[PDB]
Symmetry: D2
Subunit: 197 residues, 4 copies
């Protein structure tokens, strides 16, 4: 089964998450895992002057999403929605839509926020778009036991893994957060191989 | 695979849809299909006086949901949410939740409204609860060609089948609505068999 | 202006919150603030054997919601939705709906969850129902500065105040949580008096 | 009060709706009404080749949103979300957010879809972003009587006006759709005047 982790990250928090998802997915015997990022939409100079992080994952084309059995989408929040970059990219999947190219493919979503607010809404509102493509939607529920832990500030929801970046972007994904992310990749890769070999 | 069509209906619109869903699911050779209803929560005499429809379907218990590989939930809208009767029933699945009894099972949703408004929000707000149980969420996308017909008033969304009951409840599910409902039953059942045998 | 804080609470966390909302609302010159709870739907004996908390707020009728200028709804989550009790109560507002009794009234929502997951979805999915009644929806945004604080586990979202009850129900609303709740009551009471005197 | 009708349109459906909204808002004597569009993000030549409609409305800047008492946002759907063009624009309101520049301002949303699906989800997913800015969210409920008509295919929801463009974009907003749009403009404008003078 082929698994794409398709993400947008400006400052690396979703990048770090995407890597953990990919690691989880790679634990599954029979899973081919690929990590790509969606195109930047900001002018390059503005991206750099805002301190955007350069990334080594290659940029995806809309067209190549058809090659996968499971796509795990990562996006930071922009006010409770997916980022403009992820939105812009999904807006170019109209050809895939008309041909039913993503229909019945597995989809799962992970997110990042500055201070937590909007992390559920970002995921569930991404699910909407996935549903229009007829993708099978995979939440993670409460299998990841870190989800019960209210002793420390922690991303992660039954809807998909999340990370809390701090208001100033200074926080890094915590071990509990990355554990949920790895769980998500492995669970979805498992389902992918179950259905597609 | 075992497929439960679990529904709530007061005036029979969801009940009719539920039979169409069961009918589609039954086309799938590996699929054992059962139709049950959630308990009425209204006093029996207020229900009669309101003109409520009597229904032959057996009443489900919360516990028996664990016995199935896929549950397709039918509910009328109450102001853009599932009905209090469906909510009440799902609020009694806390034991199933704690044991992960519905985790990884397939879930799909269909709905009915008086005049169309809230039909999307009912389905996707229902998906939220399904996600807490770690259920795999199954939208229908646009495989059902009737979803492209805008020549007549008709329910059905990429999220799941719907019906339009009319302001006074006098409309009956149309051929196109029932056909989307059958498709949804077949699609979910085929996925249930693909996953579980 | 008259402000109703209308809540459901089984174990007191939303009750404690509702009291803080009411206190906030009472700081506003010209605001008449009333606190009532919706009816219990569980059999009384089961309510007691589950350790349900007895409450001194009187039970509201659906009919009396028409008397207010602003209604602040409090509910704990049941899997990312409002509780069955709140759902059941709102389902009896069909008379108010047909007469436009809540149309243009202010509405705001606060929630409680065991471990955080579903707290955004509970609020925004309650907003849906409020919208069908034509209520003006009041989120709190980021005016409450505790919302920037990622140093301690903390409820509260830009959508409305929330509290984290702990998996076992043992946590009590924190000062930061109650501060956001008080903010919400006062902000909404302010708007109520601005519009209605 | 100053009322901004801010929209994105590729094929003119939202543009037509936007003019109807402006028209309704202008009926309110205290209301100064301005119609602006968000920038196109497609290369100018891809836009022409796609058959995009040229539009006379001035292009808004993110900053000038601060100047208004009420903003009514129009966007076509992209798979159940606002369009990438609207998302991109709203992603540039981080300065306004940090200064609380839109806090307490009125917000209301209208949408357009090819065949109806995603019309609710587009509006309410847009409300999420509005809530992060602390905007007061203004749904239309069922004051517009056309919302009770199920005799013809027509957009319009309790969340805000919508139009149905057809699969090929050939439908024009109907009389009933435009009338819901006018109502929404009038209602929001009257609220803007009631709050701000
Ligand atoms: C336009 C804009 C809107 C944002 N909205 C939110 C928000 O609603 N809630 C929040 O917690 N953080 C918000 N943030 C913070 C981003 O989500 C955060 O910087 C991102 O998660 C970091 O992930 P990345 O490093 O992968 O880019 C916003 C940031 C920008 C630039
Ligand atoms: C409390 C209440 C709330 C309702 N809210 C809506 C609504 O928001 N939108 C709508 O189109 N119909 C609404 N209706 C209509 C019901 O959804 C409709 O009667 C139901 O779909 C009929 O399905 P059934 O025959 O299976 O019970 C409402 C009805 C009641 C009693
Ligand atoms: C049926 C049921 C479902 C629940 N679902 C969730 C949930 O999805 N997320 C969560 O964090 N807590 C969940 N809980 C916990 C309740 O939300 C928590 O006990 C409540 O917030 C306490 O508030 P109260 O004391 O006012 O009743 C659930 C509890 C029950 C009984
Ligand atoms: C990328 C893309 C995604 C779309 N997704 C949907 C959709 O989910 N549902 C729908 O009914 N129409 C969909 N459409 C149709 C547009 O919403 C429709 O063309 C638009 O409402 C026309 O409005 P406008 O003329 O103002 O641009 C989509 C179109 C594009 C280009
Ligand atoms: O190009 C497109 C037009 C309409 C739609 O729904 C999807 C793609
Ligand atoms: O009793 C219960 C309490 C909380 C929950 O999430 C499930 C069951
Ligand atoms: O009683 C009723 C209340 C609301 C509605 O939409 C339909 C019936
Ligand atoms: O620059 C920024 C503006 C707003 C926000 O929420 C995070 C970063």
């Amino acid at each position: 089964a082929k698994v794409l982790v398709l993400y947008y990250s400006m400052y690396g928090h979703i990048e770090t998450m995407a890597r953990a998802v990919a690691e989880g997915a790679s634990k599954v015997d029979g899973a081919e895992v690929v990590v790509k990022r969606v195109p930047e939409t900001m002018p390059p100079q503005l991206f750099e002057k805002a301190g955007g992080k350069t990334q080594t994952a290659p940029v995806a084309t809309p067209q190549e999403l058809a090659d996968y059995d499971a796509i795990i989408f990562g996006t930071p929040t922009r006010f409770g929605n997916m980022s403009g970059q992820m939105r812009t990219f999904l807006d170019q999947t109209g050809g895939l839509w008309a041909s039913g190219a993503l229909y019945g493919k597995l989809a799962s979503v992970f997110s990042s926020t500055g201070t937590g607010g909007g992390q559920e809404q970002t995921i569930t509102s991404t699910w909407t778009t996935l549903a229009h493509h007829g993708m099978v939607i995979v939440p993670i529920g409460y299998a990841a036991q870190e989800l019960f832990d209210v002793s420390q500030v922690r991303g992660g929801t039954p809807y998909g893994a999340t990370t809390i970046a701090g208001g100033d972007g200074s926080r890094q994904p915590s071990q509990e957060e990355l554990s949920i992310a790895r769980y998500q990749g492995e669970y979805v890769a498992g389902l992918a191989v179950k259905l597609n070999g």
